[PDB]
Design a protein around this ligand. Structure first.
Ligand SMILES: *[C@@H]1O[C@H](CO)[C@@H](O)[C@H](O)[C@H]1NC(C)=O
Length: 218
């Protein structure tokens, strides 16, 4: 279905599509989400138009998978995912990214945590991730510009693709493994609270079409 309501969600078959316009207050405009199909993955698209709040994210329209029982990062064997998307619009200042929160407390709220892991498959405009660049890193056979910094008490790591990656296939476990082995990330004690994919827009007008998205925890 379709909806532009601030907190609309469409759930089914282990997937949830959310408008999640948490930053609508920061500007003028709208955001709508359309869930086409949630069978064997999520096919959907987000449409929006925003002005004002130059560097304030207006929302994170996204698709995510249900996680019945939280497990530690190290205990998980693989977190495979595939994504086929495209962005159209004008003066697009936004990204396309996976978003995952982890915390030592397995019952932690799922929209935040000790850490936030982002994987930006796309980056439009002069927008910037939380923190500062830590340089280039290789994960899953692809190069990424890694960003790190605090957003309050929470630590945020953002792996930003160096070219828009519209057809992606990877294992999120590779990213956690990188942090565990290079940043002292406590993979043994951190639980994966969420596994999401969507777009954080700032200004402009755009439509993120997600022809296909799959994600799972094994
Ligand atoms: C993604 O595509 C837009 C539009 O061509 C471009 O401006 C931007 O630099 C690209 N981003 C990356 C990470 O290549």
């Amino acid at each position: 279905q379709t909806s532009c309501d601030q907190w609309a969600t469409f759930t089914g078959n282990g997937y949830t599509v959310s408008n999640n316009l948490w930053g609508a207050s920061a500007g003028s405009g709208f955001g709508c989400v359309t869930a086409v199909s949630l069978s064997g993955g999520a096919s959907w698209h987000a449409d929006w138009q925003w002005s004002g709040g130059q560097n304030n994210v207006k929302s994170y329209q996204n698709s995510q998978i249900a996680i019945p029982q939280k497990r530690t990062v190290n205990s998980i064997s693989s977190m495979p995912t595939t994504a086929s998307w495209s962005y159209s619009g004008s003066n697009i200042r936004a990204n396309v990214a996976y978003d995952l929160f982890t915390a030592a407390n397995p019952n932690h709220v799922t929209y935040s945590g000790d850490y936030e892991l982002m994987i930006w498959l796309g980056k439009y405009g002069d927008i910037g991730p939380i923190g500062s660049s830590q340089g280039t890193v290789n994960v899953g056979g692809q190069s990424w510009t890694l960003y790190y910094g605090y957003n309050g008490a929470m630590q945020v790591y953002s792996f930003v693709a160096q070219t828009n990656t519209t057809n992606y296939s990877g294992d999120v476990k590779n990213f956690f493994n990188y942090l565990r082995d290079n940043k002292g990330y406590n993979a043994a004690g951190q639980y994966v609270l969420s596994y999401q994919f969507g777009t954080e827009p700032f200004t402009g007008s755009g439509t993120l079409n997600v022809a296909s998205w799959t994600a799972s925890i094994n």
